[PDB]
Amino acid sequence: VAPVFTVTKFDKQGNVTSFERKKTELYQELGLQARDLRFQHVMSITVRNNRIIMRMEYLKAVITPECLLILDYRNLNLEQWLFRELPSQLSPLPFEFRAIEALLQYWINTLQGKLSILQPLILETLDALVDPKHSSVDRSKLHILLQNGKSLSELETDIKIFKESILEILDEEELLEELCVSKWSDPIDHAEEMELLLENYYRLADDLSNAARELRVLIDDSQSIIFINLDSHRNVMMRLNLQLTMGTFSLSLFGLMGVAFGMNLESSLEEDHRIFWLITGIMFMGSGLIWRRLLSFLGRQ
């Protein structure tokens, strides 16, 4: 079966149509070729035969002087935007300005929503992790943080490509003149308006990129602080363990002393209890003094 395109068409007045059409018929209707309607690039804005071709991550659009076409809209939850919002926007400037503004605004709003969803989750996770009241931290939250960081990196890449394309178009004026397809087809400055639009969207994308970068550096700083806190807790607990081990060693030493003096043999000292009491007292007090002196020695270090 020959491949087909599921297209939805918007007119100047805002009227909407939807259908499916063969690629060859689409090429014949327009002045394009299969080389153009291939959509091999993640982000692209191009002009061919007075027709504008735009592609986002998943949005494919063709703009003509008298109509707009969205291709492959099925299974992408675009119905609300297509059948409820776009007609209002499209209903003195030409059609190209309105269409380009609508598409760019949609993409920018999508990116803003992504960032606004990502920010609070990361902030809450970092606030929970940095809490110095716990010697350990949860790991499910760490996995969540990793996934959200991956999503943030993808968002940063998308913003970067958006800005790159917009700036590449802005620098040259030939492309700016090309975007005015209506005047070329059927011959106030259009160039100024297009420059204003592109500059506005470029600045918005730059703001988003700065916010994402700030979030990433915050993540890194939080990771470093987490490392420091864990190391400090380790050192505290090891100090306590050493302090207890000193006492254990002293106790074992004097227990060996007592055991050796208390063998089941003859020592010529079983007829006196004063010696026994003296040994008990001296062993206990010496345990105490040795423990204290070892504590002081550790403190000296």
Q: How far apart are CA 222 and CA 229, in angstroms?
A: 11
Amino acid at 216: R
Q: How far apart are CA 80 and CA 95, in angstroms?
A: 21
Question: What minimum distance in Å lies between the beta carbon of 221 and a copy of itself?
Answer: 5
Of 62-70, 146-154, 246-254, 266-274, the window that binds Mg ion (rule: CB under 5 A) is 146-154
Residue among 5 and 249 whose Cβ is closer to a copy of itself: 249
Is residue 264 part of an annotated ligand binding site?
yes
Torsion of Cα atoms, 150 then 152 then 154 then 156, to 10°: -150
Cβ-proximal residues to 154 (8 Å cutoff; 6+ apart), any chain: none
> Could you say which of Mg ion, a copy of itself, none residue 34 binds, taking C-beta under 5 to 8 angstroms by partner kind?
none
Residue among 123 and 244 whose Cβ is closer to Mg ion: 123
Question: What minimum distance in Å lies between the beta carbon of 199 and a copy of itself?
Answer: 9
> Could you say which of a copy of itself, Mg ion, none residue 253 binds, taking C-beta under 5 to 8 angstroms by partner kind?
a copy of itself
Question: What minimum distance in Å lies between the beta carbon of 249 and a copy of itself?
Answer: 5
Q: List the interface residues with Mg ion, window 150-169 (CB under 5 A).
A: 154
Question: What minimum distance in Å lies between the beta carbon of 295 and Mg ion?
Answer: 27
In sequence order, the β-bridge partners of residue 301 are none
Handedness of CA 156, 158, 160, 166 (dihedral sign): negative
| DSSP 3-state of 294 | helix
- Of 124, 113, 15, the C-alpha closest to 67 is 15
Residue among 168 and 231 whose Cβ is closer to Mg ion: 231
> Could you say which of a copy of itself, Mg ion, none residue 118 binds, taking C-beta under 5 to 8 angstroms by partner kind?
none
Token pair for 11: 């007119």
- Of 225, 213, 234, 216, the C-alpha closest to 127 is 225
Q: List the interface residues with Mg ion, window 175-234 (CB under 5 A).
A: none
> Could you say which of Mg ion, a copy of itself, none residue 255 binds, taking C-beta under 5 to 8 angstroms by partner kind?
a copy of itself
Token pair for 207: 């703001």
- Applying CB under 5 A, which residues contact Mg ion? 154
Q: Which residues are annotated as a binding site for Mg(2+)?
A: 154, 157-158, 214, 231, 262, 264
Residue ranges for the binding site?
154, 157-158, 214, 231, 262, 264
